[PDB]
C-alpha cells in the first residue's frame, strides 16, 4: 500500500521529532542543586574541549604597551577575528588569525581610552557595506566610527574605518562597559555609579537636535550610597538588559520601546542568599562574604523560565528564573528568584593521572575570577588559585547522557569537564565566541541537541585572550571523540575495540554509538592512520550493530543508526520550502552541494560493503523487514540526491522566467513545495516532471545547447527524467530552431525533416 | 649538535637543523629565531663537501627570506610595545602573537603594520613580498611623507615654546635642541628605507616617486623661504645613487606634462 521512499520518509519524520524532543534546560535544571561531573584529562581522547592553536600578540603592540605612561587595556572582537589594544589615548586593532598582521592605528582621541566595543549598526542609517559600529569611550567623550568587516580570500575579515562626525561629551560618569543590541542600540555603564546611559544617533542633522545624543536612563536623585558596575549584559530575545554591581546586586531593565529603558527588577545579594537558604541544600560556598563576579544571559530560545546564570567567586553557578506578574499587556518580568545551583567539581588539575551525594563543599574553582557561558551551556571559568598562573576549567552538558536519560523525572545537569592549563605568566582577559551562535532548534525543546547538528554547523570555537596571545579552544563532538578513541585502538586486540566501544554505549546508547561509527566510516571527523580509523569504524558498525527481532518488529540498532545519520544530514532541508518567491532558493546552493556529497558518500559506503553488512544483501520475518527497511532508506537516499540535483539544475537556468510562463495551479504547487514532498511524494515527482518539461522549452529559446542539457537530465536525475522526453525535447529543438532559421530556405528542410524523424 | 657539525665543516647540515628549528612550533622567541636563521644563512652560503651547489643555494635562500620577514616582525613588535598611543591591554596581546613563530607577510601588514600606520614598515613589506601594485605603493609613500611632515612640524613647535617660556602639553619630553626642518626628517625616512631595500626595488619607481617628493617640496614651502636648498629633492636621489640619465629623463616628463603643482611660473 505504501511504497519504499514513503516508508523511509516516515522514519525520517519520526526521527526529526525525536531529535527535537531533546530536553530543555528548565527540565534538567529543576529547582534544587547538582554536582554531577565526569572529568576528563585534557590530553585524553574524551576531552570535551582542546586547544587547537595560539596567536602571539604582535611585537609592535608590546612596544606600545611597554611605552604606556598611565593606562593600557586589551580586548577581543571574536566575532570577526580581531583583537585590540589601547595605550593612553591611542587604539590599535589587528587580525589575530593573520600570521604577521598589520596594526590598524587610530589616534585621533585626545584623552585616555577607557572602553572599546564593536556593535551592530542602527538600520537605515549607514550604507549597507557598513557591518559594525566601533564605540570608543574616553574620559572626555564617546566616539562612533563606521566599520566594514568584509571577508577576504584567506578567511579573515578585512577591516576599514569610516568617520561619522558622531560624538558626545561623556560627562561625570566613567564608561568601562559598552554593549550593543541586535538593532544597534548602544548602552553604557562604568565604575562611577550604577547609572545606565544610552547613545542615540541618526543620519539627518536638525536645527533642534544633533546627529548624536546621550541620556541617563536611571534618573538618579537624592541620597545615594557608593556602588558601581562590574558588567553589562544584553538578551535580545527578551528585550532585556542586565547589570551587575560591585555589591553583587543584579538589576534587570526592559526595553519597552525603541528609545525606552525601564528598570523592572532589583535583586541584591541578600535576596539571592534568602532564596538559597530556602533551598534543601545550603552550603558554605555561598554566604554574605561571597561575591558574584559575572553574569551570563540565557536566551528565551534556550529556556523559558531560567533567564540568567550568575557565577560566584567560589565557583558556584546560580541559575535564576524571572516571571511576569501577568500574561498580557514584549512582556516585562517583575520578579527574579534563585532556583537552581550547579556546585563546583572536586577533581583538581594534575600532572600525573590520578585515580553519589550532592557535593556542595568543593574548593576546586575557588577563587573564580572570570566566567563565561555560551549556549547550549559551554562554561569557561578562570580559576586564580595562584597569583601568577590561571587555570581554565571548561565543561559542557553531557548531551549524550541527557538525551538517553529516562524517565524525565531522572533528568539532571550532567556535565563533561576538563582543565586546560595556561603557561606561567598568562593572565586571561576575555573569552569570546568565534563561530556562529549554537542552536539546534528554535525553541527550548530540541535547542541543546549537539548530536543532531554534528554535521550541519562546525564545532564551536572560542578565542581566549591573554596578556601574551590568543588561544583557540574548540568543542569536540561525539564523532571527534569516537574517531580519536578508535585511533588509539589501531594497535590493539579485537577485545580492545569492544572495550572502548562499550564505554560509548554506556554513555550515549547503542544507536548513537553505531551512528558515530557510521559517520567516522564515511569520513566525518577526517577534516581534522585515517584509513585504519575509518576501517575500524566500519568494523564497529558491522560487529556491534545488533540484529532485528520479534517484539510488528524491532529493527536492529544498525538500521536506526543509518536512519539517524541520514536524517541529521538533511534536517535543514526536509521541512523547508524549496523556493522563496523574483523567485529564489530557500537553501543556499553551497549548502545543497555539501548535503548531496554527504548523502552520496554514505551511499558509496553502503555499496562498497553490500556483501559484509547484514541486511543489505537479500536473506525469518525479522531479517525480512530488516532488508525491506534498509532497502527503503537506500531508495530515499538516491531520491534525495536526484531531488537536490534537480533543484540545482533549476536555478542554473532562469527560474523567474520559467515561473512567469506558468499556470497558477503549478505556481501555487511550487510555492508551497517542500523538500520532503520532492523526495518522497508523487506530487513532487509529477511537478518535477512538469518543470523539466518547461525548462527545456525555455532552454531552446536561449538555444545555447540542447544536447548538453539533454545528457545533463538524462543520467544524473534519471528515474525521474524519461528517455522518451529527451528525444521529444530533441524534436522540439529542431522545431523551434526551424522557426528560428525560418527565413532561410535550404536549412529548414533538414531541420524539419530531422524533427519529423 | 650544530656546534659539532660546524667544527667538522658540515655547515649545510647545521643550516638545516637551525632552519627547521626556526620554522618549528617549539617554544622559541622571535629573536632566537632570528639568530637561528642568521646562522643558517651563513652556513648555507659556504661550500659543504658532498652537497650540490643547488641544494646549498636553495637553503641559503629560504633562510634569507625568512630572516627578512623575521626582522620586519621584530621591528613591528618593538615599535608597538613602545608606542605611547597603544593601550596596555592591547600590547600584551600583540606580544603574544608576534614573539613566537614567524608570521606571514599578509598578517604582518593587515593585523599590525597597517593598523598602526607604520608606513615605512608597510613599504618594507611590499618589498619582501614582491608586491606588484604601483598605486598602493605610492599611496603608502604619500602617507609616509605627510605623517613625517606633521611630526616634524609638531616637534619644531614644541621647541619654539621652550624658547619662549611656555609650557608643553602634559607628558611631552622637551627638545633641548632645534629639531630638523620637516624636509630633513622626511628625506631621513627615505634614506633609511632606501638603504634597507637597495633602490632596485619596486618601492622606488623613480618615475612616480621623484615627482611626488618634488610636489611635496613645493606644496609645503620646503624651499628658500626657510633656508633650504631648493634643489634638495634632486640632491637626495642623486646621492642615493639614482643614475643621472634617469633623473633628467623624469624631469623632462615633469616639464612637458605640466601636472599637479608643476605649472605656470
Amino acid at each position: 500500500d505504501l511504497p519504499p521512499v514513503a516508508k523511509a520518509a516516515q522514519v525520517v519524520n519520526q526521527t526529526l521529532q525525536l531529535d527535537d524532543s531533546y530536553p530543555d534546560l528548565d527540565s534538567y535544571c529543576r529547582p534544587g542543586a547538582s554536582s554531577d561531573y565526569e572529568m576528563q584529562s585534557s590530553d585524553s581522547s574524551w576531552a570535551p574541549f582542546h586547544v587547537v592553536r595560539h596567536h602571539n600578540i604582535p611585537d609592535k603592540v608590546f612596544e606600545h604597551l611597554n611605552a604606556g605612561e598611565v593606562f593600557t587595556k586589551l580586548g577581543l572582537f571574536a566575532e570577526i577575528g580581531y583583537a585590540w589594544a589601547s595605550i593612553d589615548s591611542s587604539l590599535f586593532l589587528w587580525d589575530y588569525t593573520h600570521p604577521n598582521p598589520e596594526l590598524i592605528g587610530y589616534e585621533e582621541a585626545t584623552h585616555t581610552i577607557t572602553a572599546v566595543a564593536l556593535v551592530p549598526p542602527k538600520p537605515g542609517v549607514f550604507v549597507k557595506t557598513i557591518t559594525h559600529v566601533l564605540v570608543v569611550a574616553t574620559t572626555s567623550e564617546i566616539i562612533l566610527l563606521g566599520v566594514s568587516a568584509t571577508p577576504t580570500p584567506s578567511g579573515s575579515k578585512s577591516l576599514t574605518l569610516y568617520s561619522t562626525r558622531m560624538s558626545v561629551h561623556r560627562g561625570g560618569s566613567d564608561v568601562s562597559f559598552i554593549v550593543g543590541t541586535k538593532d544597534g542600540r548602544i548602552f553604557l555603564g562604568g565604575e562611577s555609579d550604577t547609572d545606565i546611559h544610552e547613545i542615540f544617533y541618526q543620519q539627518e542633522e536638525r536645527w533642534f537636535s544633533s546627529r548624536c545624543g546621550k541620556i541617563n536612563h536611571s534618573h538618579p536623585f537624592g541620597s545615594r550610597q557608593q556602588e558601581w558596575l562590574r558588567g553589562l549584559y544584553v538578551d535580545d530575545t527578551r528585550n532585556l538588559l542586565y547589570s551587575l554591581s560591585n555589591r553583587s546586586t543584579i538589576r534587570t531593565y526592559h526595553m519597552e520601546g525603541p528609545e525606552k529603558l525601564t528598570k523592572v527588577i532589583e535583586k541584591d545579594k541578600t535576596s539571592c542568599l534568602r532564596d538559597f537558604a530556602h533551598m534543601a541544600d545550603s552550603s558554605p560556598l555561598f554566604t554574605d562574604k561571597t561575591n558574584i563576579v559575572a553574569l551570563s544571559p540565557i536566551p528565551a530560545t534556550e529556556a523559558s523560565k531560567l533567564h540568567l546564570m550568575a557565577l560566584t567567586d567560589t565557583g558556584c553557578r546560580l541559575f535564576l528564573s524571572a516571571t511576569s506578574s501577568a500574561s498580557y499587556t514584549a512582556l516585562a518580568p517583575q520578579s527574579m528568584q534563585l532556583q537552581f545551583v550547579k556546585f563546583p567539581p572536586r577533581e583538581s588539575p594534575t600532572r600525573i593521572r590520578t585515580l553519589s551525594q550532592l557535593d556542595k563543599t568543593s574548593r576546586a574553582l575557588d577563587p573564580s575570577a572570570l566566567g563565561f557561558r555560551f549556549s547550549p551551556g559551554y562554561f569557561f571559568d578562570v580559576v586564580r588559585k595562584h597569583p601568577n598562573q590561571d587555570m581554565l576549567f571548561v565543561s559542557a552538558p553531557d548531551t549524550g547522557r541527557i538525551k538517553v536519560t529516562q524517565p524525565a523525572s531522572a533528568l539532571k545537569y550532567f556535565e563533561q569537564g576538563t582543565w586546560i592549563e595556561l603557561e606561567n605568566g598568562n593572565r586571561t582577559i576575555e573569552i569570546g565566541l568565534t563561530t556562529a551562535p549554537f542552536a539546534a532548534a528554535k525553541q527550548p525543546l530540541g535547542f541543546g541537541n549537539e548530536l543532531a547538528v554534528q554535521f550541519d554547523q562546525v564545532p564551536g570555537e572560542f578565542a581566549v585572550l591573554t596578556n601574551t596571545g590568543v588561544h583557540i579552544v574548540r568543542r569536540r563532538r561525539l564523532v571527534d571523540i569516537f574517531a580519536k578513541a578508535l585511533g588509539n585502538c589501531v594497535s590493539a586486540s579485537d577485545d580492545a575495540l569492544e572495550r572502548e566501544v562499550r564505554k560509548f554505549i554506556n554513555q550515549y546508547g547503542r544507536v548513537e554509538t553505531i551512528a558515530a561509527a557510521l559517520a567516522v566510516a564515511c569520513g566525518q571527523g577526517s577534516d581534522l592512520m585515517d584509513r585504519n580509523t575509518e576501517n575500524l569504524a566500519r568494523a564497529a558498525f558491522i560487529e556491534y550493530g545488533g540484529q532485528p527481532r520479534l517484539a510488528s518488529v524491532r529493527l536492529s540498532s544498525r538500521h536506526d543508526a543509518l536512519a539517524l545519520y541520514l536524517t541529521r544530514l538533511v534536517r535543514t532541508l526536509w521541512k523547508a520550502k524549496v523556493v522563496q518567491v523574483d523567485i529564489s532558493s530557500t537553501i543556499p546552493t553551497s549548502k545543497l552541494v555539501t548535503i548531496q556529497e554527504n548523502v552520496e558518500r554514505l551511499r558509496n559506503f553502503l555499496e562498497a560493503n553490500k556483501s559484509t553488512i547484514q541486511g543489505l544483501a537479500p536473506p525469518d520475518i525479522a531479517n525480512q523487514k530488516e532488508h525491506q527497511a534498509l532497502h527503503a532508506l537506500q531508495k530515499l537516499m538516491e531520491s534525495i540526491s536526484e531531488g537536490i540535483s534537480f533543484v540545482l539544475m533549476l536555478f542554473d537556468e532562469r527560474v523567474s522566467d520559467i515561473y512567469a510562463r506558468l499556470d497558477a495551479v503549478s505556481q501555487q504547487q511550487l510555492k508551497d513545495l517542500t523538500y520532503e514532498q520532492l523526495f518522497s511524494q508523487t506530487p513532487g515527482k509529477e511537478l518535477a516532471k512538469v518543470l523539466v518539461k518547461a525548462i527545456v522549452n525555455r532552454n531552446i529559446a536561449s538555444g545555447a545547447n540542447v544536447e548538453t542539457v539533454a545528457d545533463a537530465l538524462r543520467r544524473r536525475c534519471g528515474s525521474f527524467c524519461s528517455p522518451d522526453d529527451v528525444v521529444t525535447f530533441k524534436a522540439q529543438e529542431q522545431l523551434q530552431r526551424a522557426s528560428e532559421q525560418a527565413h532561410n530556405s535550404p536549412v529548414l528542410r533538414a531541420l524539419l525533416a530531422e524533427s519529423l524523424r | 649538535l650544530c656546534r659539532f657539525y660546524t667544527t667538522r665543516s658540515r655547515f649545510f647540515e647545521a643550516a638545516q637543523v637551525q632552519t627547521n628549528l626556526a620554522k618549528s612550533d617549539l617554544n622559541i622567541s622571535l629573536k632566537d629565531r632570528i639568530i637561528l636563521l642568521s646562522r643558517a644563512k651563513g652556513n648555507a652560503s659556504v661550500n659543504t663537501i658532498g652537497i650540490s651547489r643547488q641544494q646549498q643555494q636553495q637553503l641559503n635562500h629560504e633562510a634569507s627570506e625568512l630572516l627578512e620577514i623575521a626582522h620586519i616582525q621584530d621591528d613591528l613588535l618593538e615599535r608597538l610595545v613602545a608606542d605611547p598611543r597603544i593601550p596596555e591591554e592591547r600590547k600584551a596581546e600583540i606580544e603574544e602573537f608576534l614573539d613566537g613563530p614567524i608570521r606571514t607577510l599578509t598578517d604582518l601588514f593587515n593585523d599590525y603594520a597597517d593598523q598602526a600606520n607604520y608606513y615605512d614598515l608597510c613599504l618594507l613589506i611590499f618589498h619582501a613580498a614582491d608586491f606588484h601594485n604601483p598605486r598602493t605603493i605610492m599611496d603608502t609613500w604619500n602617507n609616509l611623507i605627510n605623517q613625517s611632515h606633521f611630526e616634524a612640524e609638531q616637534r619644531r613647535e614644541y621647541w619654539e615654546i621652550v624658547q619662549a617660556g611656555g609650557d608643553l602639553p602634559a607628558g611631552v619630553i622637551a627638545p633641548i635642541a632645534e629639531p630638523p626642518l620637516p624636509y630633513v626628517y622626511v628625506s631621513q625616512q627615505i634614506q633609511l628605507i632606501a638603504h634597507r631595500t637597495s633602490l632596485d626595488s619596486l618601492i622606488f619607481p623613480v618615475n612616480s616617486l621623484l615627482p611626488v617628493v618634488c610636489a611635496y617640496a613645493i606644496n609645503n614651502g620646503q624651499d628658500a623661504s626657510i633656508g633650504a636648498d631648493p634643489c634638495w629633492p634632486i640632491q637626495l636621489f642623486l646621492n642615493l645613487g639614482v643614475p643621472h640619465a634617469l633623473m633628467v629623463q623624469v624631469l623632462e616628463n615633469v616639464l612637458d606634462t605640466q601636472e599637479a603643482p608643476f605649472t605656470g611660473r
Binding site: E102, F126, L145, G146, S163, R165 | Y119
Partner: peptide, 14 residues
C-alpha cells in the same frame, strides 16, 4: 600607520 578614515558621505545614506 594611521588608519585611513573614509568620509561620512560614503558611510551614511542617502
Amino acid at each position: 600607520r594611521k588608519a585611513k578614515l573614509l568620509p561620512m558621505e560614503e558611510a551614511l545614506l542617502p
